[PDB]
Amino acid sequence: VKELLEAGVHFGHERKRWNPKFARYIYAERNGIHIIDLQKTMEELERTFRFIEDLAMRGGTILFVGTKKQAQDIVRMEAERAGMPYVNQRWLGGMLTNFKTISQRVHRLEELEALFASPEIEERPKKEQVRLKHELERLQKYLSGFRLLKRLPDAIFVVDPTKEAIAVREARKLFIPVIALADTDSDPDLVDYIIPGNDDAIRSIQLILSRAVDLIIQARGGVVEPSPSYA
């Protein structure tokens, strides 16, 4: 499912703001820009997707993590396709390490779903309606994707392992495997299954994540053709 002209969309970036541990995944710096060995990206995807597929057909969740503005929506898109949890907005410390406690906050969201499902007394004061609404709206912003996650994930998918340092550290502290799209400014050794490629351009994120989902959806029953994306 992997394709070959990802060259058409990314082959890496960033001038010498690199992490030396990312050396083995670099071809050269042509424009004064670290360019990624796309053959390495291929070979890695082969190893990585193999892990993904196996995890899919054994029926276990993958928590997709993206928070940078460019990968914001694109992860809500494709993770929804998989029907798998994501965190798009703020990564709340202890989402894994303090799971049960954060999960105490979906119940609130849950209980606000029901209460506002009407009426169960709209005879609650004026000032309260506005409040609890603002609450639900609020809760909705952050726990929208995390609410699907009803128990500790089997692995996580990160768009930027550097940006998402905390998440990488939480999962790792829990022996939960970590798969990641990572460019030259990330730390390879911290990542279990690497996608050495640009993590900034939405194009690359789109290619890698959508095609990642195509692995997920295909392996747990049926398949499907193209998924929503901005040019």
Binding site: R172, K173, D189
Partner: protein, 137 residues
């Protein structure tokens, strides 16, 4: 450069600690023998006589353990511990009866004997002592 042997052991220790594939040490017959033992005991993958900018060297191919889970995924070293015993400042010599057991057998003592460079096991079999070069584990 006062102790080539200690420099070599140290060149290795520094390299393994940051997980280099190999490392180069300036070459000598006596160093080869030590590496010979090091490889044949599995502390290193092996070595080869290479040349750096015209100069004879020994490229030592490092070996580690499997990647690990948890917060620190760096793999366990194969050579945890290597340090000189006999030094230019204080030569150390043992007779066959004074040869030490490194780490209850889990490690090796390398010595230079009048039968050549041997491990503590080897030296004890051949029944000879010598200068206690270093210990590895």
């Amino acid at each position: 450069l006062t102790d080539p042997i200690a420099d070599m052991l140290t060149r290795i220790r520094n390299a393994t600690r940051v997980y280099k594939e190999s490392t180069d040490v300036p070459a000598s017959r006596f160093k080869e023998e030590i590496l010979r033992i090091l490889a044949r005991e599995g502390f290193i993958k092996g070595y080869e006589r290479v040349d750096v900018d015209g100069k004879p060297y020994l490229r030592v191919y490092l070996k580690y353990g499997p990647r690990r889970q948890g917060p620190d995924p760096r793999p366990e070293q194969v050579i945890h511990h290597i340090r000189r015993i006999s030094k230019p400042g204080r030569r150390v010599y043992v007779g066959v009866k004074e040869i030490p057991r490194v780490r209850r057998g889990l490690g090796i003592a390398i010595l230079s004997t009048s039968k050549g460079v041997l491990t503590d096991r080897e030296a004890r079999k051949l029944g000879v002592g010598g200068e206690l070069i270093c210990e590895v584990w």
